[PDB]
């Protein structure tokens, strides 16, 4: 086999700065007959298929921004992105085609940006869920940076069945969002009145508090 290895595993860069990542092969990929390196680079944006960027080590495919440049030869290859843009958030894969094909393990490129506070929204259980015997309360914490965030649920003022999920970084504004869902039985839901989502994020020493009261529904 030919072993393909990429570095770094991951990194974050601010818009406008340069990105360098590398790809090593266990064997030279330089074909002696054609005098080309059989090494290609693919970009996979979140939720998308991979897209060809560079092939033969340094040939930039038509339609690919000028800021992407492939270089290297033999066993060592480099993808350089100058003036990185928010939309360049992706996992980048190199792939040899010298002997069958083999992909590297990828480099995950994240985008660094200015800290941003979450916009927090809370939602009570729908009547169509309650009819069924369950009660989910949902809290969205949207468009914040950096990714680290704390969420606490309080029920009648006391801290408490939680599903947390983070989006991939946003391709436009480089923020993260998170959804937190508390699920109770209808029977337990109806024993209490106040339901509160509290978000603590580095952007404030004050937690952002969103609440509803069951009597107000």
């Amino acid at each position: 086999d030919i072993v393909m290895s990429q570095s770094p595993s991951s990194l974050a860069v601010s818009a406008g700065e340069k990105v360098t990542m590398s790809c090593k092969s266990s064997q030279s990929l330089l074909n002696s007959r054609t005098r080309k390196n059989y090494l290609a680079w693919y970009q996979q944006k979140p939720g998308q298929s991979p897209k060809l960027l560079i092939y033969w080590a340094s040939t930039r495919e038509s339609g690919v921004p000028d800021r992407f440049t492939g270089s290297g030869s033999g066993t060592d290859f480099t993808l350089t992105i100058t003036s990185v843009q928010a939309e360049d958030l992706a996992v980048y894969y190199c792939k040899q085609s010298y002997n069958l094909r083999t992909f590297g393990g990828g480099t995950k490129l994240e985008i660094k940006r200015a800290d941003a506070a979450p916009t927090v929204s809370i939602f009570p259980p729908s009547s169509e869920q309650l009819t069924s015997g369950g009660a989910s309360v949902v809290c969205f914490l949207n468009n914040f940076y950096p990714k680290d965030i704390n969420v606490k649920w309080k029920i009648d003022g006391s801290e408490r069945g939680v599903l947390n999920s983070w989006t991939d970084q946003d391709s436009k504004d480089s923020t993260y969002s998170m959804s937190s869902t508390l699920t109770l039985t209808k029977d337990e839901y109806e024993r209490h009145n106040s339901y509160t989502c509290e978000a603590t994020h580095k952007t404030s020493t004050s937690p952002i508090v969103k609440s509803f009261n069951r009597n107000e529904c």
């Binding site: 290609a40 298929s49 060809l52 092939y55 894969y93 069958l100 729908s126 969205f140 999920s165 983070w166």
Partner: protein, 214 residues
């Protein structure tokens, strides 16, 4: 325009077989090698195999990881590529992509399909419950709860609302997936203008439109 479209993914039991298809158009199919590549959720791409072009006798090659167990074939009359998978195991759960490959000259995979998700599991198919999430800018949502297998698709107003949407990755809890989706719109536009989430679960052929009512 070159088009590659995979089909055939879904839920299958351990030890079972499944055959994927990849319909193509927009290029001279027989001129090209075609590859299959897979990606387990959150992991790296893995090349699986290829079938050569007409000039090379349409012969096949395979990664050691699947040689002897997966078979690639092609219909040169209709420009369709196939992957037959046998004795499936949990490790085979992944998104499967077809990619256009070598033409005798260029070294590149020029084009890739959207991928088809295969889930190898003993669990039964369970359709989602879909619940509306109602309360300058206003944020609304849909909770898509308790389904299996992945995937689901969520759009808002049949795809006309796309900016200001966050669809959260599904999370598995006690053998069922749940996800949610939020949409943020101007407060002057709701409930004056309608907001509806459109949810599909192909495994159970579920189609739901949920109006967000004040």
């Amino acid at each position: 325009e070159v088009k590659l479209v995979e089909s055939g993914g879904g839920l299958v039991q351990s030890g079972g077989s499944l055959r994927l298809s990849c319909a193509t158009s927009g290029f001279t199919f027989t001129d090209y090698y075609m590859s299959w590549v897979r990606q387990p959720p959150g992991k790296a791409l893995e090349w699986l195999g290829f079938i050569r072009n007409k000039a090379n006798g349409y012969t096949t090659e395979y990664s050691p990881s699947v040689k002897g167990r997966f078979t690639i074939s092609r219909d040169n009359s209709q420009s369709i590529l196939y992957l037959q998978m046998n004795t499936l195991r949990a490790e085979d759960s992944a998104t499967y992509y077809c990619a256009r490959d070598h033409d005798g000259y260029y070294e590149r995979f020029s084009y890739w399909g959207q991928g088809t998700l295969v889930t190898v599991s003993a669990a039964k198919t369970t359709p989602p419950s879909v619940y509306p999430l109602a309360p300058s800018m206003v944020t609304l949502g849909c909770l898509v709860k308790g389904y299996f297998p992945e995937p689901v698709t969520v759009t808002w107003n049949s795809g006309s609302l796309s900016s200001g949407v966050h669809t959260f990755p599904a999370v598995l809890q006690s053998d069922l997936y749940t996800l949610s989706s939020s949409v943020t719109v101007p407060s002057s536009t709701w409930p004056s203008e309608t907001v509806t989430c459109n949810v599909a679960h192909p495994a159970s052929s579920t189609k739901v439109d949920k109006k967000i009512v004040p």
